[PDB]
């Protein structure tokens with residue numbers, strides 16, 4: 001009986017030296033992400049809407065144009081909602097589908113439904129169009145390195161549909177896409193042909209980007225079983241800072257601070273956390289002041305903070321994958 005699902009417990013990063021850190025900092029472009037990955041997503045895209053369809057096509061097209069061998073899958077399902085039965089579609093993008101282990105980055109691509117108010121439309125810029133754009137920019141910036149994957153370990157991106165409640169949060173009205181996908185992965189043998197391990201055993205770590213894009217985010221270290229990876233984010237941020245590779249950034253105002261949060265935050269990681277998947281929840285506490293208001297828009301995003309986080313995230317992923 002193979003002990004491969006335990007490998008994630010001992011997995012260590014392959015740390016980048018200074019010359020490599022400068023290369024990564026220079027290889028990501030916040031302006032290109034802004035124009036080509038983010039702006040197209042800053043539209044009304046609640047589940048089942050025309051914008052949901054447009055967001056999904058945009059995400060798939062941006063992944064499809066890359067050199068790395070991404071395999072795209074649309075996980076479409078029905079769920080009861082306060083408005084009756086509806087259809088939802090999670091987007092899953094995977095490098096090396098049969099590899100046993102994957103580091104997984106995730107966000108939700110739906111936007112919360114609101115009827116238009118005084119000609120304003122809710123586009124959830126931090127929630128979570130920016131996280132979506134960061135995943136696409138990471139795939140683009142690291143494309144050459146990811147092409148080399150073509151430790152039986154690779155990368156997977158998941159864009160959840162239906163994270164938001166159609167009304168206000170309730171156990172049954174929220175997390176539609178993640179509750180569905182977690183159950184599906186838990187009941188899917190992995191790798192193909194396995195007798196007793198599932199796709200969830202294959203998830204090394206679920207890194208969920210959430211509510212990112214506002215000024216001065218502070219991310220708490222939520223879980224003891226991913227604490228050592230939170231510490232790696234702290235170390236990466238500190239070194240990129242010391243090398244002068246971050247913009248408008250100080251250690252007093254660092255993003256990854258030494259501090260826990262004992263409460264529960266309802267989000268897409270929950271259905272995975274409750275089935276035993278290690279999670280690194282990159283959500284700030286407190287939430288952006290514009291949370292769930294029409295002001296969660298492009299104008300209120302902090303460009304240099306998103307740029308700094310792109311650099312930190314890309315370095316984390318390369319180090320985790322030994323690339």
Ligand SMILES: [Zn+2]
Nearest residue numbers: 112127164292
């Ligand atoms: Zn929200």
